[PDB]
Coordinates of N, CA, C and O and ligand atoms in Angstrom, one line a residue:
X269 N 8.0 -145.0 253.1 CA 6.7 -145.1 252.4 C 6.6 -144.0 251.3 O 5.5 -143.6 250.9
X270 N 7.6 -143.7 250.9 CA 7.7 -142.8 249.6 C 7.4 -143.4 248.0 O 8.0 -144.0 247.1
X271 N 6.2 -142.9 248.3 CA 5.5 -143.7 246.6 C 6.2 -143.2 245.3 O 6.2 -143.9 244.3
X272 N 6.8 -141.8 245.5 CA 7.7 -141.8 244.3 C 9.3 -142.1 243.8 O 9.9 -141.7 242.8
X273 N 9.9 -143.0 245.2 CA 10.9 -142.8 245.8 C 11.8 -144.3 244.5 O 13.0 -144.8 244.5
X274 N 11.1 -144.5 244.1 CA 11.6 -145.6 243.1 C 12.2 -145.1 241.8 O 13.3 -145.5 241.4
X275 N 11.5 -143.9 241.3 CA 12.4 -143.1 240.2 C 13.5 -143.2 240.2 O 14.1 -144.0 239.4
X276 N 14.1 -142.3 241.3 CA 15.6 -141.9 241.1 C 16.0 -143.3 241.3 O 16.8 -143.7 240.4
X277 N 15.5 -144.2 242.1 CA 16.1 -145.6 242.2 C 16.9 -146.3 241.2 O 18.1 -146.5 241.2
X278 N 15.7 -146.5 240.2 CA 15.3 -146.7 238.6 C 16.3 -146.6 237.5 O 16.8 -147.4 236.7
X279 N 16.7 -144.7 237.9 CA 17.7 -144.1 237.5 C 19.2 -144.6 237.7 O 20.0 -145.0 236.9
X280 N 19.3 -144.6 239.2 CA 20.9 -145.4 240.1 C 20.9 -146.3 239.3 O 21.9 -146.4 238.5
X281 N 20.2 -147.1 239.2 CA 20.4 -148.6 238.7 C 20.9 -148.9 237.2 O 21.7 -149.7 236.7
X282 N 19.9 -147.7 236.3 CA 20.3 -147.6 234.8 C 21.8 -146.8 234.8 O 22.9 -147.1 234.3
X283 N 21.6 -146.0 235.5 CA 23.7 -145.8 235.8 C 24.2 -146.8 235.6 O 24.7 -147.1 234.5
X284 N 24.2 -147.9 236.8 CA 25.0 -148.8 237.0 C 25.2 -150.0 235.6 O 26.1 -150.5 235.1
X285 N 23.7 -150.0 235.4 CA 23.9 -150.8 234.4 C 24.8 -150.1 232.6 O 25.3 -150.6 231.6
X286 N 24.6 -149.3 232.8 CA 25.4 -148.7 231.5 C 26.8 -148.3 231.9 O 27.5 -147.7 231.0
X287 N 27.4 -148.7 233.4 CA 28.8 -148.6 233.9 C 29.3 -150.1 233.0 O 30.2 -150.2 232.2
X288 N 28.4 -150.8 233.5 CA 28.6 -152.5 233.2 C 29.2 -152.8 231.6 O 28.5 -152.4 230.7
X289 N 30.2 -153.4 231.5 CA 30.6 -154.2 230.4 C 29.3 -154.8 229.6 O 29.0 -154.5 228.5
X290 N 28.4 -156.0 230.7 CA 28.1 -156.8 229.5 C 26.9 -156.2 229.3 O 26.0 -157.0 229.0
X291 N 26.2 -154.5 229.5 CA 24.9 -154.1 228.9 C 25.5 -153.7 227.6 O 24.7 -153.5 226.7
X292 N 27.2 -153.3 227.1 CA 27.2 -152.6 226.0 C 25.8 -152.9 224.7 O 25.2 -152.0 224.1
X293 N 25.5 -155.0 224.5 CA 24.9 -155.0 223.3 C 23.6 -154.5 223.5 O 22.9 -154.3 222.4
X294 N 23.1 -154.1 224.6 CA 21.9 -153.7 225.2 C 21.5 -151.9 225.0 O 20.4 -151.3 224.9
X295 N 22.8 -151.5 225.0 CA 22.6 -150.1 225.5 C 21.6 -149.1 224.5 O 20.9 -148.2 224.9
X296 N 21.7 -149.4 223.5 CA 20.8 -148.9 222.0 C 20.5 -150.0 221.4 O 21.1 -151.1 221.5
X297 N 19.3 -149.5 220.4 CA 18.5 -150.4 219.4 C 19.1 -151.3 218.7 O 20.0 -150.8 218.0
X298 N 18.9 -152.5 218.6 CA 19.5 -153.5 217.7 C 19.4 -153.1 216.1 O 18.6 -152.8 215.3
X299 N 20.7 -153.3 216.1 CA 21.4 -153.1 214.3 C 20.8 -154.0 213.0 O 21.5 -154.8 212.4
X300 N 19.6 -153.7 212.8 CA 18.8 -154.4 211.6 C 19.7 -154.4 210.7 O 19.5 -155.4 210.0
X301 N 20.9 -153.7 210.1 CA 22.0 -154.4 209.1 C 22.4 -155.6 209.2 O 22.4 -156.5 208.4
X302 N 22.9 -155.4 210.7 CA 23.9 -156.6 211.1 C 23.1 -157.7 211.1 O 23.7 -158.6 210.6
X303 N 21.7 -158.0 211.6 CA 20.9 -158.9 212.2 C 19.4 -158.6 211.3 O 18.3 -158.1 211.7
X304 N 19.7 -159.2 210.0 CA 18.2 -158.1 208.9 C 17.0 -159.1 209.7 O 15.9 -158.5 209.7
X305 N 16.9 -160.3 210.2 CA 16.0 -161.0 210.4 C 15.3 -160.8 211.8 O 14.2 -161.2 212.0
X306 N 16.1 -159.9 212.8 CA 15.4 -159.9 214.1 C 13.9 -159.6 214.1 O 13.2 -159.8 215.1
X307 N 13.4 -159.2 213.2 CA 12.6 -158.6 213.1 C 11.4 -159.8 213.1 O 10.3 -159.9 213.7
X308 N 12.2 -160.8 212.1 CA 11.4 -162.1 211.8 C 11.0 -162.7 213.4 O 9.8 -162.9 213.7
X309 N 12.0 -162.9 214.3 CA 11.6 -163.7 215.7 C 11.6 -162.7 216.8 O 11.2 -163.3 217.8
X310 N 11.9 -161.4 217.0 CA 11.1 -160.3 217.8 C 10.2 -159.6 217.8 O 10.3 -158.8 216.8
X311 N 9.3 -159.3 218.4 CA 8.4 -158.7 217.6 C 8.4 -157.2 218.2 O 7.9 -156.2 217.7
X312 N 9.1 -157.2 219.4 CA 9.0 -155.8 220.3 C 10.4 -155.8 220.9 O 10.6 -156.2 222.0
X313 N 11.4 -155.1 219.9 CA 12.6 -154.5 220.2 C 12.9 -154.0 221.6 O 11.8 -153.5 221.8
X314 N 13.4 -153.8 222.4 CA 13.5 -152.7 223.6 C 15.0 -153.2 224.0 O 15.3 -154.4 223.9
X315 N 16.0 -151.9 224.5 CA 17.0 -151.6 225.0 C 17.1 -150.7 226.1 O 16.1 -150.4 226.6
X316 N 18.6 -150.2 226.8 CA 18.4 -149.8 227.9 C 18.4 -148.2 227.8 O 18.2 -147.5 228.9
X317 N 18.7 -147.5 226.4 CA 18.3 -146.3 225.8 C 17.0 -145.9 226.0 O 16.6 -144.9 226.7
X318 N 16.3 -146.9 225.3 CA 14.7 -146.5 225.6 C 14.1 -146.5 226.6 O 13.3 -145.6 226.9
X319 N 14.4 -147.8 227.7 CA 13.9 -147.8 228.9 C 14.5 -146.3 230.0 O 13.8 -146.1 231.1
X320 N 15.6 -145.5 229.8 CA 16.0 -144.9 230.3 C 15.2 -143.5 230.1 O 15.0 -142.7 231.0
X321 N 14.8 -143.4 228.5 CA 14.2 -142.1 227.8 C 12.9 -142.2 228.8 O 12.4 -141.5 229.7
X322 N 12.6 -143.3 228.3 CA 10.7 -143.7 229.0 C 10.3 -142.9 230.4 O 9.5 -142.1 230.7
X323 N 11.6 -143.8 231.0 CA 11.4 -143.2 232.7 C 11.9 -141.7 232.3 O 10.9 -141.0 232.2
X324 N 13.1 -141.1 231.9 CA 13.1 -139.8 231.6 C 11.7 -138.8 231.4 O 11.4 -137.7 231.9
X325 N 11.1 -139.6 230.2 CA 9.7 -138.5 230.0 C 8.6 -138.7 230.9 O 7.4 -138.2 230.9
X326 N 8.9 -139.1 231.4 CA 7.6 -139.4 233.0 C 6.8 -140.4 232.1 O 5.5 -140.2 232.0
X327 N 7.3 -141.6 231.3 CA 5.7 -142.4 231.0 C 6.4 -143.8 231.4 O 6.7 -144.7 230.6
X328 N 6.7 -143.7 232.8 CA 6.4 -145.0 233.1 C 5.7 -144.6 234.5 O 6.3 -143.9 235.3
X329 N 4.2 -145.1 234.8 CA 3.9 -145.1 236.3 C 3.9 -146.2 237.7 O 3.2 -146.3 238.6
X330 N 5.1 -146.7 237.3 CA 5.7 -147.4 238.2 C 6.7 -148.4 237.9 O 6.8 -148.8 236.8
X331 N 7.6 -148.7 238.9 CA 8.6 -149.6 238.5 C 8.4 -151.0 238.1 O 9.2 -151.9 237.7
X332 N 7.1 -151.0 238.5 CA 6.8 -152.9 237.7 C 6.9 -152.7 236.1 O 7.2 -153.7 235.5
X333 N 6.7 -151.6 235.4 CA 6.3 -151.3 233.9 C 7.7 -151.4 233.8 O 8.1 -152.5 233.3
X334 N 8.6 -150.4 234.0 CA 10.2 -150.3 233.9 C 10.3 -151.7 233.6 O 10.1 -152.1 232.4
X335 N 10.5 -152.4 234.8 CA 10.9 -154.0 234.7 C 10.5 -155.0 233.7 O 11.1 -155.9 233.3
X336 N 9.4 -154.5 233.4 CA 8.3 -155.4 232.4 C 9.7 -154.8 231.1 O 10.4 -155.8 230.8
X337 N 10.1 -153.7 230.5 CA 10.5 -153.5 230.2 C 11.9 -154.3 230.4 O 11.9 -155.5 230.0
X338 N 13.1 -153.9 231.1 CA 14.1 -154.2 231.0 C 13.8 -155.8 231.0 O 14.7 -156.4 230.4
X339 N 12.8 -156.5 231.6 CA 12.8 -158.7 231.4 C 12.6 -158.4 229.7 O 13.0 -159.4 229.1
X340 N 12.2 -157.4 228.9 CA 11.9 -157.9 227.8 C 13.1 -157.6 226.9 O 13.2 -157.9 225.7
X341 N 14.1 -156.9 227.6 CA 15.5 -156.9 226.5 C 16.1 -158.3 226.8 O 17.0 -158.7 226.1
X342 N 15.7 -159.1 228.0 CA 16.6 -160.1 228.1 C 16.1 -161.1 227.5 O 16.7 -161.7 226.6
X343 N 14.7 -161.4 228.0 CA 13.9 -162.1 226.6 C 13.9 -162.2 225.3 O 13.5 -163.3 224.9
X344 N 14.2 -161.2 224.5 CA 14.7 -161.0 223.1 C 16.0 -161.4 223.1 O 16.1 -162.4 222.3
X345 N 16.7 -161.3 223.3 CA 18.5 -162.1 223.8 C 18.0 -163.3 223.7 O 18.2 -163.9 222.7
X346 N 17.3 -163.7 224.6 CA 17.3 -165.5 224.8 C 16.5 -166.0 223.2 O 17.1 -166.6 222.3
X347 N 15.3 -165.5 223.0 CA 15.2 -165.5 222.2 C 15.5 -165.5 220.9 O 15.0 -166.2 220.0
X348 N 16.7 -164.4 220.6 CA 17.6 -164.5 219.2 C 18.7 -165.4 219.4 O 19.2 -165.8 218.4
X349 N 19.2 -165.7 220.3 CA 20.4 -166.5 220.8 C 20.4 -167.8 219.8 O 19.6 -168.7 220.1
X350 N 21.2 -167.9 218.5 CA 21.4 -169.3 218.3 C 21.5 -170.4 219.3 O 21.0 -171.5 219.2
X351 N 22.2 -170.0 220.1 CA 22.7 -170.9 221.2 C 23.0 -170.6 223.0 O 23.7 -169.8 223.4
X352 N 22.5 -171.3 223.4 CA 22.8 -171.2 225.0 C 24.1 -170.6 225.6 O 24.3 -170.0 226.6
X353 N 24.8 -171.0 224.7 CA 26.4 -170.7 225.2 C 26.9 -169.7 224.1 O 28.1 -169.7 223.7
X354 N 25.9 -168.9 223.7 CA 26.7 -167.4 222.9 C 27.3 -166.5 223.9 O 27.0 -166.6 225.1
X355 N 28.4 -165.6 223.2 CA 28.6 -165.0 224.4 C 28.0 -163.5 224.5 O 28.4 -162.8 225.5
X356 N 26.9 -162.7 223.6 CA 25.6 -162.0 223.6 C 25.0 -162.4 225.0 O 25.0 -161.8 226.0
X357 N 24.6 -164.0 224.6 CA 23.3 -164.3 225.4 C 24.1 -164.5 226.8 O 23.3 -164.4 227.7
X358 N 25.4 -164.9 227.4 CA 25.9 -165.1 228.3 C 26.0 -163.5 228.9 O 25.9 -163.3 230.1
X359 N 26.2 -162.6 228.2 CA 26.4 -161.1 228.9 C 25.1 -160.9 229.6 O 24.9 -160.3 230.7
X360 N 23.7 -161.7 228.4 CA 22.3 -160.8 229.0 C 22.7 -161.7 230.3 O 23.3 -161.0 231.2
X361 N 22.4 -163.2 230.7 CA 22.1 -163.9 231.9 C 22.9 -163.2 232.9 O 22.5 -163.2 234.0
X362 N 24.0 -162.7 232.8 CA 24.9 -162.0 234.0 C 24.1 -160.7 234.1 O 23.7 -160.5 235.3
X363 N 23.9 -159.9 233.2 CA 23.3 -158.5 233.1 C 21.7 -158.5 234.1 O 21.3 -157.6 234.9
X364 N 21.2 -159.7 233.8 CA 19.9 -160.3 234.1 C 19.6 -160.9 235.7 O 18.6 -160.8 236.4
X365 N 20.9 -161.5 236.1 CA 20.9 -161.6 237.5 C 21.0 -160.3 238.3 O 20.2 -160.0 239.2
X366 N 22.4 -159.3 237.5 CA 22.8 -158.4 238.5 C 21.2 -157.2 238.5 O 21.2 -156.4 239.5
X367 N 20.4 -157.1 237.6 CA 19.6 -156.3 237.7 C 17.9 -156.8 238.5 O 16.9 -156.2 238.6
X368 N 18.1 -158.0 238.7 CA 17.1 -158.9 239.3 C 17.6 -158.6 241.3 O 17.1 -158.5 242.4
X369 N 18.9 -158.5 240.6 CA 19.1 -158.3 242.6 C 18.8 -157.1 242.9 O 18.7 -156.8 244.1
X370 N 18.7 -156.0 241.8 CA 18.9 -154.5 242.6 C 17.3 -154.2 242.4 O 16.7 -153.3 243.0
X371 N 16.8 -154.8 241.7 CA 15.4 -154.3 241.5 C 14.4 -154.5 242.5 O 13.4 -153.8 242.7
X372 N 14.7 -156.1 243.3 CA 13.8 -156.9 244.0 C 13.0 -155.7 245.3 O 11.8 -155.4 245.6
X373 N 14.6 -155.1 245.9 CA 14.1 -154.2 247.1 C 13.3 -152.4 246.3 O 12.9 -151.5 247.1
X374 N 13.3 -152.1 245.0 CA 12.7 -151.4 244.5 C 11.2 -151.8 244.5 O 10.2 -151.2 245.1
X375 N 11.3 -152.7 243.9 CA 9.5 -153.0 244.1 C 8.6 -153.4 245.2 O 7.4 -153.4 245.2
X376 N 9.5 -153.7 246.3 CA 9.3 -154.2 247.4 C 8.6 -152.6 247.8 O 7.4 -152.2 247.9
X377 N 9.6 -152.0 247.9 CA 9.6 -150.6 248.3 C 7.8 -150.0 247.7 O 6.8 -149.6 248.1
X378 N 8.4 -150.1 246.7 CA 7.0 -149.3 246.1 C 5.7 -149.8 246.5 O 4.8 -149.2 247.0
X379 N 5.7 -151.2 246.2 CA 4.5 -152.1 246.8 C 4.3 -151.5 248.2 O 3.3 -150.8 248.4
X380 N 5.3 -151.7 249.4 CA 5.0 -151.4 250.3 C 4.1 -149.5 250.8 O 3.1 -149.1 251.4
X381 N 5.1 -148.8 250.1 CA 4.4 -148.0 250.3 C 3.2 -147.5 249.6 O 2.6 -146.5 250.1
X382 N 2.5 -148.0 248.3 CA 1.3 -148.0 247.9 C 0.2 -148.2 248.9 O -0.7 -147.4 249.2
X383 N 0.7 -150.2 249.6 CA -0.1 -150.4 250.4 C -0.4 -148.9 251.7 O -1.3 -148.1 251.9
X384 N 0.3 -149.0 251.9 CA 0.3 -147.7 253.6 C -0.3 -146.7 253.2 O -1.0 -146.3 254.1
X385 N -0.5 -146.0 251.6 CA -1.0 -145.2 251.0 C -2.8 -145.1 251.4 O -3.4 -144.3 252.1
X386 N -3.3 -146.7 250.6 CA -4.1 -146.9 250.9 C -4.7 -147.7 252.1 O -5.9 -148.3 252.1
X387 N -4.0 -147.8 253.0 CA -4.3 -148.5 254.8 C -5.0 -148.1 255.0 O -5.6 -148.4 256.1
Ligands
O1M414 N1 23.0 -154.7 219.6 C1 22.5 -155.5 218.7 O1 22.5 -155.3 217.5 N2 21.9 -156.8 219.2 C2 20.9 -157.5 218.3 C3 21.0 -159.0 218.6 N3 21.0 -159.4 220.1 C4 21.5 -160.7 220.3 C5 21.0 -161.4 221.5 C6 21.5 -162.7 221.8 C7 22.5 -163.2 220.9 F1 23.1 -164.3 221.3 C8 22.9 -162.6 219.7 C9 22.4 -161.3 219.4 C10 21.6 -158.4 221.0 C11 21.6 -156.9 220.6

């Protein structure tokens, strides 16, 4: 029932994910040289740099915000993806499963112990 016990979690997990091959296109801000138009069909950039800094400076207060965060780098992927079968957008959907399995028992966690908080 440790309400702050998701942090370091948070942390493990952005480890793992910056171990991973297919976060490289993820890991920092998208390259407006390479890609001058993202701008035209994203409107809210986010990578696994920033989400890392965020939780670093204490401004996220809970791990649903984190997440809100990390679904919206994959969402921009889907969204810039010319095509279903790029291999960008094929790294996010693998990137996207493996961080959907590790997060599920984080939020569980937290949720649960909020509730008990307030029992
Ligand atoms: N590191 C970068 O400069 N990019 C910007 C574009 N982005 C992307 C997503 C899907 C796709 F199929 C093609 C490109 C990923 C991150």
């Amino acid at each position: 029932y440790d309400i702050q016990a998701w942090k370091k979690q948070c942390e493990e997990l952005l480890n793992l994910i910056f171990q991973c091959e297919d976060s490289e296109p993820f890991r920092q801000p998208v390259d407006l040289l390479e890609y001058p138009d993202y701008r035209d069909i994203i409107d809210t950039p986010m990578d696994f740099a920033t989400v890392r800094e965020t939780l670093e400076a204490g401004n996220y207060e809970s791990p649903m915000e984190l997440c809100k965060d990390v679904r919206l780098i994959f969402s921009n992927s889907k969204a810039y993806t010319p095509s279903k079968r790029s291999r960008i957008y094929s790294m996010s959907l693998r990137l996207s499963a493996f961080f959907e399995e590790h997060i599920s028992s984080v939020l569980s966690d937290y949720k649960s112990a909020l509730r008990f908080h307030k029992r």
